[PDB]
């Protein structure tokens, strides 16, 4: 079913495929990062604000 080595390495092997079509390979790779919500967006925006502030301070 899903556990007991039937589906985990199944997913790993299915993902680890040749993907001859270039668009297919790109869509396979893009299916790796989870989507984001508003709180994550504002938190990452705060992190980027801190990063650019630190870059300005370095300058």
């Amino acid at each position: 079913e899903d556990e007991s080595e039937a589906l985990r390495q199944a997913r790993k092997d299915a993902e680890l495929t040749a993907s001859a079509d270039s668009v297919r390979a790109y869509l396979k790779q893009i299916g790796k990062v989870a989507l984001l919500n508003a709180e994550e967006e504002v938190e990452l925006a705060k992190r980027i604000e801190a990063g650019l502030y630190a870059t300005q301070l370095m300058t």
């Binding site: 199944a10 092997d13 299915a14 299916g31």
Partner: peptide, 19 residues
């Protein structure tokens, strides 16, 4: 297993995406 057969088909019908 029916799910096993379904995933085996998924291997050779739509590879490149986890089933």
């Amino acid at each position: 297993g029916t799910d096993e057969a379904l995933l085996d088909i998924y291997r050779k019908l739509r590879p490149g995406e986890p089933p």
